[PDB]
Design a binder for this molecule. Structure first.
Ligand SMILES: Oc1ccc(CN2CCc3ccccc3C2)cc1
Length: 315
């Protein structure tokens, strides 16, 4: 509306285009997801675009096979001022998209299934551009879902404290309407969390477990950096010896870039004197590798290995 109104209300270009996308999704899921599919294609620097007939009739396999041929150096590698902010923008887009869809659309069983299947399929592509773009997207997607799970948790606690106060207040008395709504609230929220845990599994088992050992070092780095993020954000779910084995296995990586990320991830965990108990078995299992990297060969890896070891020491 007015200039005062538009300024006080600092919706970015990205927040605006996600509000519009949601409005379009509510008119026609199909055209909205086609646009979202084309976005991920254009983001890879692919010069083709999916039409509504392909979307409705073709499997992701066929779509990706047909877009594989329409390939001429992709946005995420470009140097130049006009692509400086692209990576940062791409990542922000995905958090804004999902933050905004987090209360309804995400739980419709069509939007997230479409995106994740497309990302999974692109992550199995021979084309570097496709693997790099889809994995980075899926890794930020996962983090966006973890933030949703954290928001659900808060509500799940307030629903549980309210359900208690009302269950106590009754006792001997017939279960009234307030108690039935809260007992129905509490099921819905836990059913929401199951669905989040589900999308996180599809992304983890479909993309992460394959991409973290990718041929391309930047893709390996992207995976390691992000599992470190899930392990700090949501400790009860991701900070365990099955997920940690991925980080430890990758300490042995051939590239500084990737060894560096493994150490930055473990640094963020070991600083918190609280999940320090949950790293005991991990510390016994990989103390030898960690301690060896203090003299790594790449200066900056050594500096980080040394910083990690002093963290472990002080705990
Ligand atoms: O994001 C989360 C991931 C896992 C859990 C739940 N735990 C226990 C349930 C379960 C069942 C079978 C195998 C593994 C698991 C995982 C909670 C949150």
């Amino acid at each position: 509306g007015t200039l005062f109104e538009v300024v006080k209300l600092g919706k970015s270009a990205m927040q605006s285009v996600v509000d519009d996308w949601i409005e379009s999704y509510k008119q026609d899921r199909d055209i909205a997801l086609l646009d979202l599919i084309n976005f991920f294609i254009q983001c890879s620097g692919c010069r083709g675009t999916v039409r509504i007939e392909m979307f409705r009739n073709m499997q992701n396999a066929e779509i990706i096979r047909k877009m594989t041929e329409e390939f001429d150096d992709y946005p995420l590698t470009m140097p130049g001022p006009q692509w400086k902010k692209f990576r940062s923008n791409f990542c922000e887009f995905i958090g804004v998209l999902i933050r905004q869809c987090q209360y309804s659309i995400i739980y419709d069983e069509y939007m997230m299934d479409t995106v994740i299947s497309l990302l999974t399929g692109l992550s199995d592509s021979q084309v570097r551009a496709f693997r790099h773009t889809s994995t980075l997207a899926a890794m930020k997607l996962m983090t966006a879902l973890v933030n949703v799970a954290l928001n659900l948790s808060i509500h799940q606690d307030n629903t549980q404290r309210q359900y208690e106060a009302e269950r106590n207040k009754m006792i001997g008395k017939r279960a009234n309407e307030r108690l039935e709504l809260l007992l129905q609230k509490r099921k819905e929220l836990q059913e929401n969390q199951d669905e989040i845990e589900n999308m996180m599994n599809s992304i983890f088992k479909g993309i992460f477990v394959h991409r973290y050992r990718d041929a391309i070092a930047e893709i390996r780095a992207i995976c390691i950096e992000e599992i470190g993020v899930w392990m700090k954000m949501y400790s009860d779910a991701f900070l365990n010896d099955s997920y940690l084995k991925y980080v430890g296995w990758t300490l042995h990586d051939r590239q500084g870039e990737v060894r560096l990320k493994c150490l930055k991830a473990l640094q963020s965990l070991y600083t918190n004197r609280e999940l320090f108990p949950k790293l005991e078995l991990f510390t016994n299992r990989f103390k030898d590798r960690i301690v060896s990297m203090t003299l790594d060969k790449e200066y900056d890896v050594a500096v980080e290995a040394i910083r990690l070891v002093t963290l472990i020491l002080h705990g």
